Symmetry: C3
């Protein structure tokens, strides 16, 4: 059992400074030792340095840093593809969530039947035509879903991307802040999700049962876990750019990670949006980073019963 | 869909200064825009100024401000009655919970088959003969329930009140601090309630299902939601006069409000007992008021999924 | 209905100073008045002073204060036995969890068919051959279980102890920090437990149902509740020596206690590991002690509905 750890310090998917220090904060919270102790063989790729693009002007006077996000994702995809081909489960540390464009593309390159569990307060499925922010970290899923491509225009620096998964192959968990055009998209393409409300109704156990039945109920598939730290309640994960009240509890987050581990199918994991600079204190930053480590470790077999 | 907003800054239902600033606090937290965004057509009656009563002596050397509370409610009932008769769902902002005497009386004046969902840490059903505090905010249900009336003496300033709710038409959610004579009343009159213990057992989904079966299971009825902010855990709503540990989570409160909205029957709502002065800090005051706005917005259609 | 309250200010079952002040903190938080209010007839034994042992050297260069813990427990067992024989339900305030060796031995002396509910973040079932800390508060169950006696060496000061519980007669609730030898022990002897994970899945109501089915499903037995304050999440019980994130909520703790009371079979209760010195503020110390009084009171009949 081998795990590749990749630092992807990207910030250009949004506008708030500091998310680029996420990977370092997560490492400092003891990630590598935690994974080693579970018996993971580790390759640390370090923090990547992405090639910048000069004069990376607004696309359509709205989408910010499109070429930089495109190129950095192209490079990240390469590293992820290569690491999966060498037999590593891939852990990518963010960084803002636009890097899932790169990790999922790289992952799907030779694992085209992968499925995605997207744990997040947000759906991240705005297209360039629906986003009201221009921030690519709120759009990553739109570039990945094949049913959507007639609705997704061609961004400078994005041409290397080819929609790799079907809308039946991603399930959301934790939703609570969804833009109206994203609601439309989720309903219109019948994309399955479990909002905080569904968790309130069903309980996290049934949510995971139904998630897996939908994705791997009839066949084994490599799992991509894309975990936005803002899925957790802001009291637990304050150091993040877009906190939304009413999130997952600590126990809920661990249970999700546990069930991910229990499938035996986890092939890649994104842990994104930890921004240590947004914490009002050092303790707030460290608790967020510690929580990130707990998720990753539980995803690779750390249990609550020894 | 039309909504009337009425500020009722009453404090004389109890002894702690500051609850009369509840309405201003809730408005400052952005109530009106939130309602507008949902598509509510809004009529703001502003904050009412209630007529004072000279020489409003204790009743029976115990009950404080009887005539002031009586008259203020009479005046409040008039405003509520008029707004509901003009087609408005009526939102009343408190103020202590004694104002439910006026809002429920006024609501019933136009919609006599109304039922009541009472969300509260407390039962508020003491009578003038059982109260150990003398505070009218802990007695309002006693003046409203038909079955209790031969046990409720006539208070100065209360003679205009016609008890308008049968004991089978009110359901409590959130109970955890109930005086022994209130417990006797609840059992003797077979009044239904879901205490925090019941919520622990059933979960909030089943609690709402059963609440609606009891109230509107046989026929459609207009719903009065009387929501005491102290129903929420003190950690979430610190700025209130009688906090009690072990209350509703944020998610539970939202789920209650959502199910209220989903019936299509909400006709009036009280949001009471927000006291900004009892906050330890301005942060605690704003989070309590923000929570109040979330309850109201959710009750009129705000969802956690877009 | 008679309750004996025994202060057991012991600290030598572990290495952190201050847990010996647990009983006083709990008394200061109003324990006696709370029990009286429920109709408990009270005998206060005050805080016991345990006989010290000179030159109490490490056993096997690892196990700390063995003779001191052995002797204090022998003395405590005598007091508990006498109180139980005199017809008292026995409340023992700690002090570290090694005192359960004494309370359970004393209790079993007159009620040999007793069963045990162990509420705790930890399993406390290391033996002198498996412990990595050397701290006896993490081993008390090992001295009590009949099935383990062939794997438990004889310690100085421990010779009076006669294992009195079968492995089918103890249930754990709340586990989340279990050493690998303890996990082996639990599975190997088929000791039943409900980890935090089980609680996330089942809900606390189902957990208590199954707990009682296992222990008293066939016959009525006197119940010993051994409650380590660290079962609660550290946000609620911060003043304790070995806190572990992701614990019981307030409501879960009350629910557990309420069910214990509802059996009518509660015969003895330990409330251990309150260490007021580990609080970073007096408020933190007080809320922990307040929480301890809530558990005890609820175990003897305090309700959330009056
Ligand atoms: N839907 C958002 C989501 C941002 C969070 C991205 B993440 O990776 O962290 O989940 C936010 C849209 N929102 C619309 C209302 C405005 O007031 C603020 C931006 C967007 O920018 O598209
Ligand atoms: N039962 C109470 C209710 C207070 C809360 C009113 B509300 O609108 O906020 O729900 C409190 C009675 N309690 C009796 C014990 C005394 O120590 C304190 C007051 C009362 O004053 O009648
Ligand atoms: N298993 C522990 C239990 C301590 C808590 C006892 B209690 O009464 O409070 O439940 C802890 C073992 N742990 C092993 C890893 C070390 O780094 C820390 C101690 C032990 O010391 O044996
Ligand atoms: Mn995201
Ligand atoms: Mn997000
Ligand atoms: Mn109340
Ligand atoms: Mn009230
Ligand atoms: Mn213990
Ligand atoms: Mn413990």
């Amino acid at each position: 059992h081998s795990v590749a750890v990749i630092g992807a310090p990207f910030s250009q998917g949004q506008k708030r400074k500091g998310v680029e220090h996420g990977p370092a904060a997560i490492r400092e919270a003891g990630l590598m030792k935690r994974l080693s102790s579970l018996g993971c063989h580790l390759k640390d790729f370090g923090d990547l340095s992405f090639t910048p693009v000069p004069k990376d002007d607004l696309y359509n006077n709205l989408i910010v840093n499109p070429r930089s996000v495109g190129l950095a994702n192209q490079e990240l995809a390469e590293v992820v593809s290569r690491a999966v081909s060498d037999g590593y489960s891939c852990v990518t540390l963010g960084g803002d969530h636009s890097l899932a464009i790169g990790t999922i593309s790289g992952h799907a390159r030779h694992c085209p039947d992968l499925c995605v569990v997207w744990v997040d307060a947000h759906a991240d499925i705005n297209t360039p035509l629906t986003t009201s922010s221009g921030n690519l970290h709120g759009q990553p899923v739109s570039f990945l879903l094949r049913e959507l491509q007639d609705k997704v225009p061609q961004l400078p620096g994005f041409s290397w991307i080819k929609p790799c998964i079907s809308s039946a192959s991603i399930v959301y968990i934790g939703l609570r802040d969804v833009d109206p055009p994203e609601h439309f998209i989720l309903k219109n393409y019948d994309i399955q999700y479990f909002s905080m409300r569904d968790i309130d109704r069903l309980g996290i156990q049934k949510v995971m049962e139904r998630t897996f039945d939908l994705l791997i109920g009839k066949r084994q598939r490599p799992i991509h876990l894309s975990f936005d730290i803002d899925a957790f309640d802001p009291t637990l994960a304050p150091a993040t750019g877009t906190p939304v009240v009413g999130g997952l509890t600590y126990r809920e987050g661990m249970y999700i990670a546990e069930e991910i581990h229990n499938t035996g199918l986890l092939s890649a994991l994104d842990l994104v949006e930890v921004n240590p600079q947004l914490a009002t204190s050092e303790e707030e930053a460290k608790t967020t980073a510690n929580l990130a480590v707990d998720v990753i470790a539980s995803s690779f077999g750390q249990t609550r019963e020894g």
